[PDB]
Amino acid sequence: MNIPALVENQKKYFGTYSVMAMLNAQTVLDHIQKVADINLWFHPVMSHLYNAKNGYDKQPEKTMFIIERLQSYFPFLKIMAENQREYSNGKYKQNRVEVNSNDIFEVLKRAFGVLKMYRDLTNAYKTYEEKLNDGCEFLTSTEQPLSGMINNYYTVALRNMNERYGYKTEDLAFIQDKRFKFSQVNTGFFLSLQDYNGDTQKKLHLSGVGIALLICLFLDKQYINIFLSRLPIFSSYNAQSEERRIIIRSFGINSIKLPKDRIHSEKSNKSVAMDMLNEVKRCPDELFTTLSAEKQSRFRIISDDHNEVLMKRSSDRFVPLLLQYIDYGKLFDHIRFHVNMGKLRYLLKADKTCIDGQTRVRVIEQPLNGFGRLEEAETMRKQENGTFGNSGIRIRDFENMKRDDANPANYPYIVDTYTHYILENNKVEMFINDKEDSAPLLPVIEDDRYVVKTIPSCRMSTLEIPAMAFHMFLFGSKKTEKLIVDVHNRYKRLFQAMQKEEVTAENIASFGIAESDLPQKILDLISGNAHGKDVDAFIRLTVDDMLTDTERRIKRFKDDRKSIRSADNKMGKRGFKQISTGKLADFLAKDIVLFQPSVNDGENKITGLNYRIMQSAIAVYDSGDDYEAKQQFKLMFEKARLIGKGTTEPHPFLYKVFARSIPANAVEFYERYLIERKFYLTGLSNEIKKGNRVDVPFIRRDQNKWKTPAMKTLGRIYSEDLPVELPRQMFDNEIKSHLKSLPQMEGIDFNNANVTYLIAEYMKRVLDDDFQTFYQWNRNYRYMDMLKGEYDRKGSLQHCFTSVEEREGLWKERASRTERYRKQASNKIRSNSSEEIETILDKRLSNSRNEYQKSEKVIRRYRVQDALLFLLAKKTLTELADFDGERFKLKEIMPDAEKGILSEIMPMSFTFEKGGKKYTITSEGMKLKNYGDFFVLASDKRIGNLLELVGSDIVSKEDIMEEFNKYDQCRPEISSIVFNLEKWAFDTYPELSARVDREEKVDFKSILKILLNNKNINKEQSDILRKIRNAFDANNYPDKGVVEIKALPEIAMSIKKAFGEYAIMK
RNA sequence: ACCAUGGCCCUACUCUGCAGUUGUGGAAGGUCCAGUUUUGAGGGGCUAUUACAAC
Ligand SMILES: [Mg+2]
């Protein structure tokens, strides 16, 4: 088999990027090893998989971690592993429905093996390669299988293009219509991934384009673009063509995600303002989903460093941004937000026998939660001596990741975590200090074991934060804070009175809290209607609901299995069915513990580590009908005391699953579990129907839920045990009184005006502003498709893009239009039971309608949230610098704005910490829209070693960007200098040429040695050549002193020049 | 081939994340209903999701 001509003609590019591909792979493998405490197919992580089904797995938690993370960092592995399952079923005449570690291992073994081969050929002037001999083992076992896998991978990757970029059949037909001939692979197609490569046996190998594709699976998008742009793989499509962009996008769509090295930026009032403006230029994710491909394309921007960026929000950061704004601004004197500052780890037992009978370290974690301004808390968290707060306890370095560490001397320690706000369950928790300028409230640690935490004063809905921000903007943060504190103190006075039994229908109004903001139980208690929930009703209902769900799951599973055995089940298309044992094992572990009876305050039920083991054990269980492996699996549940004689709290029905025979694998186990669950619940239903009393493990009659509430008992729980739950519409009356006094707001009906409405009226009427233009763009919703009722000739339902006015009117007419929809839709089901159809449609319309309504409500919240960020950011920056900005308006903000605030030029300075050092990058003048550049530079692996060479931690942004682009241009020229050096050595010393013919591997290190021994170079020169060459392969800079360098932005250029001169030879 | 019918809760803001139990709590949050809302406003039902304690 011959090396493809594309490879031979672009050898310096294939050489460079093959090395980058292999290094990136090793990086991921190394990361996974470290985090999990475990010839790339011999890596510890890959060995683990290889051995993972050699008998009953002793480290299921590790196996499952490796399988999950490999699919995160290598997204193409989901597609290829699915193809490898289907392949094996073929080969061994099996019907395995689920992907396992053998699939993952085999895909990656082959990918790595072929990558390594091409890396070696392209990085050597002359070597012998036995592996290219036609009909050899390498070709038959590894390379030829991989070419077919890659070709099948690309079928699915092109399907993914439709989802990810909105491409239509017409857009992709120049590839999809021409890949296969009539079905063969069309090796004559210009983007064919397979070719004969002059193989006399006439078997399909990877083509040059195919080799490029394999490499690009292991590159970052930036390098995919640099690499492919050098290659003549675009037939006659030109640089600006859509076809070129489609090709390149197809080669990056599922490529490697590299683990990020942690960065910590210094925040300020200015930085927060700029983080806010860069938030509002991006598309909210809920909106992005609804937009046409053209308008989605408008958020795909080219940066200053000529890199395409998706300007889309990955999460709603409104609330954290607002908290940073308040903290860095020092705007609240008394209120402090709930922060986490790491976790305490203490070793309970070094050798704990677990429910699978394997010994493991038992480490307990407690969060270090507290209250203060993020900067002040962070200054307290890490002392100079590297201890936490005033605790004495060591904070372990972030790079040290031995979580399995069994040495008692190493414990306790605190995990190093930058102070962040705790923002879970759409809440903000806060602590109210009596005095101003209080110090951060860090938790005390007792017995090196207990973290003594503090119940928050009170908790606010994140949906209340827009009105708080708006109130802050109109009145001032101090007035805002006084109002939160006053509301809090009213609830406290109420709950104190409850505890004295001094709250009546006659005096409830005196407490100053509206009925709609009192708990129903207080309202029940003063009305004389206090009652518990009816436990028997709840049991009867729960049993019925669960029986129904059990049957739903039985059916879905039988359906999916049949679907998975079908030819029509196509990955990347919409009705694609997959059975994940991970997903099965999640269901089973939750349910097994749900049905485990509690005793002794719940101290008998499965604990955290054993839970993780049980769940993982299930996920990977697959006896080969090996008797021991079956016994081992059953034994786990015996040791958890769920089945077995002499158990006192057994699971009610799990033991039936193991009666007669042990299930052979996770899939058998899930099926049998669900059948047994169905029989248990049917029995219960039948006993309920006879009027008998039944009990289920997870309903407990002694819980307060079921009893009548008392005033005094409930008073104490509300005062002492929980945070105060702050009401919605706290700030409304004050907001409305203010706005009523403004003459521009004169013609507003304030009796039908919520705060969402009034923010928008404020922007329009007081400020002559409006929301960003992309909130007027037409949107698509399935539900509105159904209501519009428009089909193509073939008879599919059309995807409309409507305006808000259109949808207003469809919604008014939804009853009629739903009637039409159902009539047509039912016919189309029948053409492909009356009750079953009506049910199928019922669910279709409900789900769709609910999706549409929620989406529209949330986008309307994003609008006014953006108004508030814009307003606050603009206020910060107005009062900074010699900056004038009364003219700027939210309506001008756009993802690549050429006007308004984002186009303004100001000096900037970005300070951050990475790997224990602290650096600053400055600009003398920079458009606000480019502030994101700094994170891109700080994130770059080279930033550290580069700044070691500059000899300054402070550097110009423009200089570093130029340096990084010049580095990127030098890297292939390094490859060429090596090539010409090797070539000289071969021409001068025929020893080397002979060593090729005698089938020995000649490498660079060897050639340096020959050059040294014949005094073509000396040790100094040898060492430099070696070190520079290594630095470029690492995609990094060499250590200081190796070579004399110039200043930025010519460091890489100067290193390239030195290499070139040290490679001349006598 | 085309066409048609994550275990979960990360393109700097911390995935080195989240994913055991028991208790407490539904004024909040989630979810469902509909002559409800393009004004996270209101109504009705259901529900421990944030937190803390103990293990
Ligand atoms: Mg309300």
Nearest partner of A923 among A945, A956, A893, A950, judged by Cα: A956
Among residues A667, A689, A711, the one where a domain terminates is A689
A857 touches strand B (CB under 7 A): yes
**The two three-digit tokens of residue A737, written as one number:** 């009184």
Asked if residues A749 and A766 have their Cβ atoms less than 8 Å apart, the reply is: no
Say if residue A812 is in the same domain as residue A919. Answer: no
Please indicate, yes or no, if residue A480 is contained in any of the structural domains.
no
Q: How large is the angle between the packed helices A76-92 and A101-122, nearest 10 degrees?
A: 110
Nearest-angstrom CA–CA distance, A665 and A630? 9
Nearest-angstrom CA–CA distance, A13 and A298? 32
Say if residue A60 is in the same domain as residue A97. Answer: yes
Nearest-angstrom CA–CA distance, A720 and A1038? 61
Kindly calculate the radius of gyration of chain A based on its CA atoms and give it in whole angstroms: 33
Residues 473-502 of chain A within 7 A of strand B, judged by CB, are 491
Between the alpha carbon of residue A794 and those of residues A38, A172, A791, A798, A998, the distances in Å are 55, 21, 8, 11, 66
Between the alpha carbon of residue A963 and those of residues A278, A726, A943, the distances in Å are 26, 53, 10
Asked if residues A324 and A267 have their Cβ atoms less than 8 Å apart, the reply is: yes
Say if residue A778 is in the same domain as residue A653. Answer: no
Say if residue A1000 is in the same domain as residue A892. Answer: no
Say if residue A1009 is in the same domain as residue A1058. Answer: yes
**Within 7 A of a protein CB, which nucleotides of strand B?**
1-8, 10-43, 47, 49-55
Please indicate, yes or no, if residue A750 is contained in any of the structural domains.
no
Q: How large is the angle between the packed helices A581-594 and A666-689, nearest 10 degrees?
A: 40
Nearest-angstrom CA–CA distance, A961 and A967? 10
Please indicate, yes or no, if residue A108 is contained in any of the structural domains.
yes
Q: Which residue shows structure tokens 């290594």?
A: A1030
Please give the single-letter amino acid code of residue A534.
D
Note the Cα A801 to chain centre separation in Å. 29
Q: How many domains does chain A have?
A: 5
Please indicate, yes or no, if residue A979 is contained in any of the structural domains.
yes
- The DSSP line for A525-560 is HHHT------HHHHHHHHHHHHHHHHHHHHHHHHHH
A808 touches strand B (CB under 7 A): yes
Nearest partner of A195 among A186, A83, A132, judged by Cα: A186
**The two three-digit tokens of residue A606, written as one number:** 């499965």
b/e for A755-772, b at 16 or more Cβ within 10 A?
bbebbbebbebeeebbbb
Tally of CB atoms within 10 A around A111: 26
**The two three-digit tokens of residue A11, written as one number:** 């050898």
Strand A917-927 versus strand A954-956 pairing type: parallel
Say if residue A940 is in the same domain as residue A1038. Answer: yes
What element of type H or E holds A273? Answer: helix A269-280
CA A831 / C1′ B19 distance in Å: 44
Asked if residues A756 and A864 have their Cβ atoms less than 8 Å apart, the reply is: yes
DSSP structure class, residue A334: S
Please indicate, yes or no, if residue A398 is contained in any of the structural domains.
yes
Indicate the burial class of A390 (C-beta count within 10 angstroms; 0-12, 13-18, 19 or more): exposed
A453 touches strand B (CB under 7 A): yes
Nearest-angstrom CA–CA distance, A215 and A255? 10
Which residues, 6+ apart, have CB-to-CB distance to A376 below 8 Å?
Answer: A439, A440
Nearest-angstrom CA–CA distance, A588 and A582? 10
Say if residue A872 is in the same domain as residue A928. Answer: no
Asked if residues A356 and A613 have their Cβ atoms less than 8 Å apart, the reply is: yes
Q: Which residue shows structure tokens 């993982």?
A: A616
Angle at A213 between CA A208 and CA A214, to 5 degrees: 95
Please indicate, yes or no, if residue A213 is contained in any of the structural domains.
yes
Asked if residues A364 and A642 have their Cβ atoms less than 8 Å apart, the reply is: no
Asked if residues A247 and A155 have their Cβ atoms less than 8 Å apart, the reply is: no
Say if residue A302 is in the same domain as residue A367. Answer: no
Tally of CB atoms within 10 A around A395: 21
DSSP structure class, residue A979: H
Please indicate, yes or no, if residue A1035 is contained in any of the structural domains.
yes
**The two three-digit tokens of residue A565, written as one number:** 């055995």
A423 touches strand B (CB under 7 A): no
**Residues in chain A followed by a break, C to N above 2.5 angstroms:** 38, 182, 832
**The two three-digit tokens of residue A803, written as one number:** 């305006």
Say if residue A545 is in the same domain as residue A673. Answer: yes
Say if residue A893 is in the same domain as residue A989. Answer: no
Among residues A843, A874, A901, the one where a domain terminates is A901
A145 touches strand B (CB under 7 A): no
Number of H helices, E strands in chain A: 40, 20
b/e for A207-234, b at 16 or more Cβ within 10 A?
bbbbbbbbbbbbbbbbbbbbbbeebebb
Which residues, 6+ apart, have CB-to-CB distance to A675 below 8 Å?
Answer: A554
Between the alpha carbon of residue A712 and those of residues A503, A523, A722, the distances in Å are 10, 14, 15
Say if residue A884 is in the same domain as residue A952. Answer: no
Strand A395-396 versus strand A413-415 pairing type: parallel
Strand A335-353 versus strand A427-432 pairing type: antiparallel
Angle at A876 between CA A871 and CA A881, to 5 degrees: 135
CA A796 / C1′ B4 distance in Å: 8
Among residues A866, A901, A936, the one where a domain terminates is A901
Please give the single-letter amino acid code of residue A613.
I
Nearest-angstrom CA–CA distance, A3 and A126? 13
Phi-psi region of A447 (alpha: psi -120 to 50; beta: other; left: phi over 0): left
Domain that holds residue A391: 330-474
Nearest-angstrom CA–CA distance, A103 and A85? 6
List, in sequence order, the alpha helices (H) in A832-956.
834-878, 933-938, 943-950
A602 touches strand B (CB under 7 A): yes
Nearest-angstrom CA–CA distance, A75 and A153? 11
Nearest-angstrom CA–CA distance, A379 and A440? 9
Ligand 1 centroid to Cα of residue A516, in Å, is: 7
Which technique was used to obtain these atomic coordinates?
A: cryo-EM
Asked if residues A878 and A309 have their Cβ atoms less than 8 Å apart, the reply is: no
Tally of CB atoms within 10 A around A965: 15
Please indicate, yes or no, if residue A739 is contained in any of the structural domains.
no
**The two three-digit tokens of residue A635, written as one number:** 């034994």
DSSP structure class, residue A441: B
Which residues, 6+ apart, have CB-to-CB distance to A555 below 8 Å?
Answer: none
Say if residue A847 is in the same domain as residue A791. Answer: yes
With CA of A263 and C1' of each nucleotide, the nearest comes out as: B12
